[PDB]
Amino acid sequence: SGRRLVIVESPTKARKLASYLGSGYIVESSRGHIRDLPRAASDVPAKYKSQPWARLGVNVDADFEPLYIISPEKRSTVSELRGLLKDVDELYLATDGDREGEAIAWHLLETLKPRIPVKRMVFHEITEPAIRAAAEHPRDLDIDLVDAQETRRILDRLYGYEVSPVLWKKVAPKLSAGRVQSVATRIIVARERDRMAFRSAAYWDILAKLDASVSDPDAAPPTFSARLTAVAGRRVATGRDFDSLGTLRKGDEVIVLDEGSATALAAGLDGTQLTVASAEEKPYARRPYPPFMTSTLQQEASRKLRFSAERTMSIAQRLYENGYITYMRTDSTTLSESAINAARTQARQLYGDEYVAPAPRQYTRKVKNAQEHEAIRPAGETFATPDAVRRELDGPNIDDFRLYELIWQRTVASQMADARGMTLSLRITGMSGHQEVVFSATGRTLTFPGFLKAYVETVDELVGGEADDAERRLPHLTPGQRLDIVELTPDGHATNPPARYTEASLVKALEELGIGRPSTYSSIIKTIQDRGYVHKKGSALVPSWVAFAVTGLLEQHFGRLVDYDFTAAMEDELDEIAAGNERRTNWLNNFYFGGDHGVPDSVARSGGLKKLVGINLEGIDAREVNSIKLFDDTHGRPIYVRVGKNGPYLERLVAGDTGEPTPQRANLSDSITPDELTLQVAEELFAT
DNA sequence: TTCCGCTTGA
Ligand SMILES: [Mg+2]
Ligand SMILES: [Mg+2]
Ligand SMILES: [Mg+2]
Ligand SMILES: [Mg+2]
């Protein structure tokens, strides 16, 4: 009848689509992109190597015409499709329905060059009605989307291949700089600077255990603990009252109790009774966690299962290829009605009708009205039991089930009832001899666990906090009730520097800033580690001195290229290209040469990217760029770190026999993190 | 020397 060729991007869809379609339909896969810009000069065809832009791959002097070549990894895949194209009646371009997927269909047109009719439709749901809906109602190739994808491609190409040579002439060779990797490095570097410029401050208070069984034996719990809050109408300072330099923020508003000060208030207080001023309770209701997307999956697998980004997505790949979970590269949290009414079934069989939500639970996001797959959840209409997945997946690599259980529990919890409870706020007054003291304590009750019986989020390893199912019981006291002082213990504390970035906390920061995509979060963690900018200290992402010099040079003379707002603002200028108003050539002309467009501080206002690199390969001294300013010594001589041929080395200008300037230097290895390089540690390795 | 995004086997 009619041999029709359907091309998707995933082989898992191929065998799946070939079942709902049947005979006559040939379903093959491209495995992503087939064409890309030449990665190096060796990939440029011979007739273009002499052209003065073969290093870029884009003809920036002729309306930004790229040089698309077949990527050698996808070379054999192209030959298979060209042969299948010779013996078919029509060609169906059924790639994804996003910006990158639409360009692949256009790349398939330019590469295959068919003479048969071509239809462009998108398959979201994999069902017989959804297959018959998009196929019977085709569509045209969105050229505005392809021009937007090209504009994103050429942008990242001009960014990376023009700014990286700046690092080669100012820092070290073979270094890289990108719209994503340089900003991710800039985040980890900025956090380390916060820990380096952090001055701790000590503060004290009183921890008092109390008793209420005297005035009310029928009380539960009979005892509880409280802390000191106010002394003589003046707040007791805690962590939130000190800034990054140890000074006070509230100014003349709080007290700073010391050891002798607190032990005196605890001394002249025991033996007396405390009076309950107020005890106001308040109800609350926690909504269930949304289903797993790519970011939240990597976060929870890092906090609970201690998996890395590559370890998580490698397991999710095998789980998807074997038909256990859906597509793991997604930015959506939506569920199909088959998955909703199935998670409500498994939850009811496991926790009864008491914990199942009485209302349909759906958690939607945004992108472009209807341009945005679904969440990561167990595939099929009937969820495979985690017991059967535990059997079918044996071997020492049991991680395939431990990650599957998380997806099976998280999805079930999304369709369960809320968590009902109450929280207290006790204000306890007293008299410490001649001064008025105020004690305060708070607790949280979990009357109805709900979805917390199936899945509970894990706290961060470094940030630290309270679990969402942790209870803090307190007795119900009456205003005016008298409490006995069981124990008084003045404890001392100190403010701690900001926490390092984990692989989970960094991905959470990238997704919130709009940087990187679900299919790139793992590659970002790998890239900044392979380029030599970030290394792991157990679970913390620690920067390097090369990362300080690269980020420092970038944030000085290429400030907008490393701004967190850049990718978000570039995405807004890209969404207009995909809808009209602006053109592909006009926007690239402003970004590379200059124009009236963008935010006030954008690159088009600064004279384009070409002129921005020209004034930096001319009016920049690498000796000042390789100067990571640390601090001054006891004599006021500045100490800075320089990055050389041998490696990162410490340096300051000291006096010698004839005086100054004698550069005294030392060596630095990655065993001393930047926050651990104080003036004492610096003076140690300076001597010997 | 170098980019970001798409997706699997070399
Ligand atoms: Mg795709
Ligand atoms: Mg305390
Ligand atoms: Mg209560
Ligand atoms: Mg615009």
Numbering used by the authors: 16 to 387, 389 to 704
Please give sentences taken from the publication describing this entry.
MtbTOP1 and topoisomerase I present in all bacterial pathogens are type IA topoisomerases that are needed for resolving topological barriers that require the passage of DNA through the break created on single-stranded DNA (ssDNA). M. tuberculosis topoisomerase I (MtbTOP1) is a validated target for much needed new antibiotics that can be used against the MDR-TB (multidrug-resistant tuberculosis) cases that are difficult to treat (1–3). The MtbTOP1-704t construct includes four N-terminal domains (D1–D4) and one C-terminal domain (D5). D1–D4 form a toroidal assembly found in all topoisomerase IA while D5 represents the Topo_C_Rpt subgroup of bacterial topoisomerase C-terminal repeats.
Compared to the structure of MtbTOP1-704t/ssDNA in the absence of metal ion, the extra electron densities in an approximately globular shape between the scissile phosphate and the carboxyl groups of E24 and D111 strongly indicate a site of bound Mg2+ ion. One water molecule, W1, was assigned to coordinate the metal ion, forming a distorted octahedral geometry with one ligand missing. Interestingly, the water W1 can form a hydrogen bond with another TOPRIM acidic residue, D113, proposed previously to interact with Mg2+. To evaluate any conformational change possibly induced by Mg2+ binding, two structures, MtbTOP1-704t/MTS2–11 and MtbTOP1-704t/MTS2-13/Mg were superimposed. The resulted small rmsd value of 0.69 Å from the alignment indicates no overall structural impact upon Mg2+ binding. A close examination of their active sites also found no major changes aside from the side chain of R344, which moved away >0.6 Å from Y342 and the scissile phosphate. Considering that the ssDNA is intact and that the distance between Y342 hydroxyl and the phosphorous of the scissile phosphate is 3.13 Å, we propose that this MtbTOP1-704t/MTS2-13/Mg structure may represent an enzyme-ssDNA complex following DNA religation in the presence of Mg2+, as further elaborated later. In the structure with MTS2-13 in the presence of Mg2+, E24 is critical in forming and positioning the binding site for Mg2+, which can then increase the nucleophilicity of the 3′-OH during DNA religation. The position of E24 in the MtbTOP1-704t/MTS2-13/Mg structure also supports the assignment of this structure as the likely structure following DNA religation.
